[PDB]
Amino acid sequence: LMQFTLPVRLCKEIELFHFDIGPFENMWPGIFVYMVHRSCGTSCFELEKLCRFIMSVKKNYRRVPYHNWKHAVTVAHCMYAILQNNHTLFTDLERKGLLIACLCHDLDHRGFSNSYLQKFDHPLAALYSTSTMEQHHFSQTVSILQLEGHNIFSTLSSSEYEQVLEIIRKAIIATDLALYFGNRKQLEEMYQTGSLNLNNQSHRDRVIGLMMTACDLCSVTKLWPVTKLTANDIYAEFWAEGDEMKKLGIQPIPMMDRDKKDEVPQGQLGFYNAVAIPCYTTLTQILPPTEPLLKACRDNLSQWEKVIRGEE
Ligand SMILES: Cc1ncc(C)n2nc(CCc3nc(N4CCC[C@@H]4C)nn3C)nc12
Numbered sequence: 001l002m003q004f005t006l007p008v009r010l011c012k013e014i015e016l017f018h019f020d021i022g023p024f025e026n027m028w029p030g031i032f033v034y035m036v037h038r039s040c041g042t043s044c045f046e047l048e049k050l051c052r053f054i055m056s057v058k059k060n061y062r063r064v065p066y067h068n069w070k071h072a073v074t075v076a077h078c079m080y081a082i083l084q085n086n087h088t089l090f091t092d093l094e095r096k097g098l099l100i101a102c103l104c105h106d107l108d109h110r111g112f113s114n115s116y117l118q119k120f121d122h123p124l125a126a127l128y129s130t131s132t133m134e135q136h137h138f139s140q141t142v143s144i145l146q147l148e149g150h151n152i153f154s155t156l157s158s159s160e161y162e163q164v165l166e167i168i169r170k171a172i173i174a175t176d177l178a179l180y181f182g183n184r185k186q187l188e189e190m191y192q193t194g195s196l197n198l199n200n201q202s203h204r205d206r207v208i209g210l211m212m213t214a215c216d217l218c219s220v221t222k223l224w225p226v227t228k229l230t231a232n233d234i235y236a237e238f239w240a241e242g243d244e245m246k247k248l249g250i251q252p253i254p255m256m257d258r259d260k261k262d263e264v265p266q267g268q269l270g271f272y273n274a275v276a277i278p279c280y281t282t283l284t285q286i287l288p289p290t291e292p293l294l295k296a297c298r299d300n301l302s303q304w305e306k307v308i309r310g311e312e
């Protein structure tokens, strides 16, 4: 049968946490299939169905600066690196579901936060009062799964199918960063007091939720030029949202105000200290082989400190 292969530099570097998928969009589908085949097997999905699904997912990501098809595939690769480094901790269904979840987790993102949809009074904010965009992302995933020829899970039983769609629903909802703070605290406390138990389903749910946050934030784990250039795309979205907040007659939060451009280096420090470093610290305690993500995050925090000292 038909293995996907990659050129040698990609074949070796795709295994590393800090891999950058590159600027050649037409190679991203192959990179993803390559990752499914090695983390899941050539038997997991019917190739023709998997390809149809991938191409429909791509079409349902928008041309926005950050929450785009490149972000989706980036987040899936960080998940591939976690899965491949913790071979024996994950079930066959988890292997199947989580790469799909990561590819789907921002489907049909418009470049605006849950908070902007609520203030604008977008219809999605009436349909979904909390985690607004994330319930939408999961809803788009089920839509694409039900297009003809797109059921990549057709070989699973009724109960296995329901289990995988539950793994995907929870992984996608967990990417709402408002939910992350509490999840990480519960995980920290369970780890410290020795109650953490990976046979407990609700414990696994929290661990998978944290892996989702880690994958979603993985721009902070890259080589510094990747980190720094991704930050430009992140603020390009945030600042457009700030502009829209000002059109509604509302002072945006600092993060989203382009007039506070100068404070970016200090905003990045708060972000690394409040979100990123604690995310990868807890992840590393639970899954020791994920330590390269924490080491790379720490390295990028030093680079933001250098930008503030005027050395970078
Ligand atoms: C790298 C990255 N990955 C994912 C996400 C969600 N984020 N979110 C951020 C923004 C962090 C931020 N910046 C600011 N600023 C910027 C200047 C004014 C004010 C101090 N505040 N905060 C809190 N950066 C990331």
Ligand SMILES: [Mg+2]
Pocket (backbone or CB within 6 Å): 105, 106, 133, 175, 176
């Ligand atoms: Mg999202």
Ligand SMILES: [Zn+2]
Pocket (backbone or CB within 6 Å): 071, 075, 105, 106, 175, 216
């Ligand atoms: Zn995302």
